């Protein structure tokens, strides 16, 4: 059983060397699937429909 | 020319796990769960090849206080030896202070961790429940 | 027994406010919300917007 | 520098750059706080069955 | 009242134009100030303390 809410705010972030030149596209694809609910439907899937 | 990208992880349920019958399997189909389909579509947006690597000591990377050297995937990516690392990572100020995090996916915090203690309302014993037969 | 304590509240999800037509619904005549369910997807989302 | 609860979005990613998120936001549902409504007569039978 | 659970995953994060030097080290006071958890005091001085 999970009790009481976060004690902490926290995030999952993709891990890119400094300078790195894909750094900027991926980040924009992370907020186009984070725009497009991608990430809902795919943590429902992995976490709730199963 | 365009090369193919050195994706490294770590085996973790239900983020990165091996198939049942990976065995007969090759490369990055070899391995399942949400964070493979999400560098899928990493891939599929960004348009580049890929390759599904796991982290060789198994952590997710720290610096040492002695020889300052970073482990893990951390390290693999500060020396080099992958090109990108996608895991559900925790981002920390020591880890940005050393490559670089893309904006938060998902938002997580601390989580208390406690057993179901179960007790089912009896039937036919509950009704001389109170003091005693 | 003998409570007033109700908190009975309507809908309690927004889907349920796609499910009636009683309580108007709305936001902002701009905003990235406006924007949001413009574009989006979602049966619920599509119907509400 | 812009320091404002200014929603994160594409089209904003797009022109300038944005810092990483001191605030996770979510869309809302903002209701009229109903009064504690009284049972009446139905309360007669109400409690311990239906 | 506020009823039902956030609709998606927003956040609010500190707004510069592309290009400017001061994105990198305000970036870092945010991880810091967050890793200090300041935000959440001040998040409940303005939200719920008052």
Known sequence: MKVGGNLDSKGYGIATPKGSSLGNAVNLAVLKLNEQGLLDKLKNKWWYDK | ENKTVVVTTILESPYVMMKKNHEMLEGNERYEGYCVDLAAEIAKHCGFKYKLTIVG?????????????????????????????????????????VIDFSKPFMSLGISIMIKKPQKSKPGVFSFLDPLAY | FLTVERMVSPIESAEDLSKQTEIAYGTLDSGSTKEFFRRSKIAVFDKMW
């Open chain 2, 57 to 97: 000591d198994g952590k997710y990377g720290a610096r040492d206080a002695d020889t300052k050297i970073w482990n893990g995937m951390v390290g693999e990516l500060v020396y080099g030896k992958a090109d990108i690392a996608i895991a559900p990572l925790t981002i920390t100020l020591v880890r940005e202070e």
